């Protein structure tokens, strides 16, 4: 009932009692643990309800209060009668927040509470999606100086009149399959540009192209529409040191704004909820450039610095790992955009882990994706123990619509 | 069940059958997951069924499952449980199970090796010199002038409980650690409160930087005796870097044989509580941990000074810098050397494709991603994509209390 974590490094032991809140699954059972695995009615609504504005009206100091009474009641008077209810604007915000502070993989939550809510429920066609998305983009943007953001389009009633961002984040570059064999551009993109051509949009077929976004409302068949290109904030990436490395060509985007996650809150689904923060550097430099299955540049970064790449042993991978992060971070910095190295962002997450024990009593936390995908050893989170669980309101994965869309 | 997982780099998916089989706890449960927490006298009730499960085990490896010899061996083991509450594994059973605990060790990358290990059998030993002598020989043996062979030696099991064989040194061969009056700590930290017992024992210390620490054995429940091991047993490779002069001043060097001594070896419900087992290094357990943990020898500022990067703000990199600069260079002077050693991509790469045989001739391949994945580059190995599936099979190692909290002194 009381759970130690122990940090290995400092021997700080610190007491979970929050994880007696947990209510979804792990996928773990006493035999099998599935910590490495990716992905493992009226009736079910009011007790959902009753979940969240218990935890709501406390969150304000106010439980077993008369206004939290009435409001218990009227969200049962609304189910009974509509088979749905809709949540104050308050209770709206408050969710999002906490949907952003459970989320166990997120190291950036020291920013919980700063996150910017926009309230898109009265939002009806996918024109107006597009509307409300530019208005993020450019307020999340906010010339390089970032601010973390979400918007929160209509919740789902019977699952046949769905809002959907078909893109997988606001801003990505498209993925092209070449007669020779190869793939231009970020091969994770492959399916989702097919469809956007399939859909018919004017593929410009180079290395970097901005998607459009495939925007669904109210469960119709999804539209296309481009961002403004001057919207789209982007950083050319070079070297401090190596002159060539501007010569590949490199560069990305300024803004990661995850676009298909559900957001629960309450029992109520919000289907189409993209937010977004700013980006750790390795999230650049590791997994985009360097995933085999990504841009893959580490081969060729190796060639230009002129390492032994006869043996693994003599670790040119590694050299020219730290290289092209330098040049991330160098990148950003020097273009004044947000950004934050993994040191930096660990370092602040154990101090929120820290804050969270005391005044909340835990913090769930993933250690697969807490530790950074480069250097894990050295940074503070690596020897720190941690206890994964559900809490809600919560950032769920749900299946990409294509599959799902009934066209 | 069939239980899937996932390659995220390769797409590659595998099917895993073999969690049927699986027996302790993981110490998750379906509300909380304790996937990163490093920690999560049997009555003849309990012993029957374990060695029952084990011996049929070791009958349907050898194709002789349900044969004459192993009805006969299960009656003649429950016959020697009934009347003795316990009962004596055959040279190759221990065998068989020792290789397996190996096998099912979810944390060891280094696992495609585990049909070869070399078994010395102590089960005769009755003291702590001769657990001494074993443990030379095992030291000889396995660090064969620097072409490293993997062994593990087996002590008596244990019994009541009150006449157990312990190694209490964590690893045979480790350096001692001094803390000083002024707080600092000479040598490794990581072995101050053992150094201190050793002392406390009537160890003479050097007190330097790397004092290969006595051995302080315990046989048959009693007080534990000191023993140095004869220093041209222990092999040693001063570190040095291809390209860098200064980096020999630094004055490090490390022990070529990793011997792990304070882990449990459970086999049919039995308990080998001395069981020290070595391998080789994978170059990061020495440049990234033992030198580069803050509780450590926590050499990243020294190392980076030198190199004269900017250590002004973390986005410099610096850290990340010095890390592969040190890591070069363990792997080069192991090498250099003549010393057997692996890097962490060659580890990886080969754990993988263990990995997937295992899939294929067993049904799967248990593994601990928090320890599987290496504590540097961790993205680029093609482990960190790998889902995994961790889960307990016997035969095990398992920890257990060390043994200064446990043990009643006899004077
Ligand atoms: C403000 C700066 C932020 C930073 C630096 C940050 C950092 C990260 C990183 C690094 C990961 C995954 C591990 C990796 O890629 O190495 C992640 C995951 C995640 N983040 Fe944050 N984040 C930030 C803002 C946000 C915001 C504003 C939200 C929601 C309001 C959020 C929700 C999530 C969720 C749900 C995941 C897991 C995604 C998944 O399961 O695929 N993050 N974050
Ligand atoms: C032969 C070469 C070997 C290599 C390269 C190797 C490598 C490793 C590494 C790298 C780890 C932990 C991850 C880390 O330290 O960064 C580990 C853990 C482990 N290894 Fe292996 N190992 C080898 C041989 C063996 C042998 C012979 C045994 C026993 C028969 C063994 C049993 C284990 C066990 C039980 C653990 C988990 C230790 C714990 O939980 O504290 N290994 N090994
Ligand atoms: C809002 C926000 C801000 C910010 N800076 N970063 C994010 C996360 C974005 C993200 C996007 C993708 N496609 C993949 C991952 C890791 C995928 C992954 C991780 C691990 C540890 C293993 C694995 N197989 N895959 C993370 C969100
Ligand atoms: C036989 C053998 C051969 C070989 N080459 N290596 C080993 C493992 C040795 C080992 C020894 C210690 N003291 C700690 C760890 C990991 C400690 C650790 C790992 C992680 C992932 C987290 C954490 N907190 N601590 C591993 C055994
Ligand atoms: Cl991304
Ligand atoms: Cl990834
Ligand atoms: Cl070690
Ligand atoms: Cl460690
Ligand atoms: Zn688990
Ligand atoms: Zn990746
Ligand atoms: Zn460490």
Redesign the pocket.
């Known amino acids: 009932r009381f759970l130690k974590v122990k940090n290995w490094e400092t021997d700080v032991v610190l007491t979970d009692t929050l994880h007696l809140k947990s209510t979804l699954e792990t996928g773990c059972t006493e035999h099998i643990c599935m910590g490495s695995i990716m992905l493992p009615t009226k009736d079910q609504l009011f007790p959902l309800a009753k979940e969240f504005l218990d935890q709501y009206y406390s969150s304000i100091k106010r439980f077993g209060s008369k206004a939290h009474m009435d409001r218990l009641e009227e969200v049962n008077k609304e189910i009974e009668s509509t088979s749905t209810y809709q949540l104050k604007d308050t209770e709206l915000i408050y969710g999002?927040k906490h949907?952003?502070r459970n989320?166990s993989?997120?190291?950036?939550?020291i920013?919980?509470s700063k996150?910017q809510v926009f309230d898109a429920r009265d939002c009806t066609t996918a024109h107006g999606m597009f509307n409300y998305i530019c208005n993020h983009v450019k307020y999340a943007t906010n010339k390089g100086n970032?601010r973390?953001?979400?918007t929160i389009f209509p919740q789902r009633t019977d699952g046949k009149h769905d809002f959907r961002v078909w893109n997988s984040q606001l801003i990505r570059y498209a993925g092209y399959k070449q007669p020779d064999g190869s793939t231009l551009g970020d091969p994770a993109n492959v399916q989702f540009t097919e469809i956007c051509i399939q859909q018919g949009w004017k593929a410009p077929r180079g290395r970097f192209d901005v998607l459009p976004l495939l925007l669904q409302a109210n469960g119709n068949d999804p539209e296309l529409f481009q961002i403004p290109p001057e919207l789209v904030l982007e950083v050319p990436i070079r070297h401090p040191k190596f002159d060539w490395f501007k010569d590949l060509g490199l560069k990305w985007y300024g803004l990661?704004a995850?676009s298909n996650?559900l957001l629960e809150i309450g029992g109520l689904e919000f289907s189409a909820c993209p937010?977004?923060?700013?980006?750790?550097g390795?999230?650049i430099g590791v997994?985009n450039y360097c995933d085999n299955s990504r841009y893959n540049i580490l081969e060729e970064v190796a060639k230009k610095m002129d390492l032994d790449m006869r043996k693994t042993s003599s670790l040119w991978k590694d050299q020219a790992l730290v290289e092209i992060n330098i040049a991330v971070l160098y990148s950003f910095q020097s273009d004044k955009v947000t950004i934050?190295d993994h040191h930096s962002?660990t370092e602040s997450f154990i101090k929120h882990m820290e804050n969270e024990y005391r005044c909340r009593g835990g913090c769930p936390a993933d250690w697969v994706?807490?530790v950074?995908?480069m250097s894990g050893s050295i940074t503070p989170v690596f020897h720190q123990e941690m206890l994964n669980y559900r809490l809600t309101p919560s950032?769920e994965?749900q299946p990409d619509p294509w599959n799902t869309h009934v066209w």
């Open positions: 999002a949907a952003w989320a993989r997120c190291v950036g939550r920013q919980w996150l970032l973390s953001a979400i990661p995850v996650m937010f977004s923060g700013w980006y750790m390795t999230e997994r934050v962002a994706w807490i950074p995908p950032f994965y």
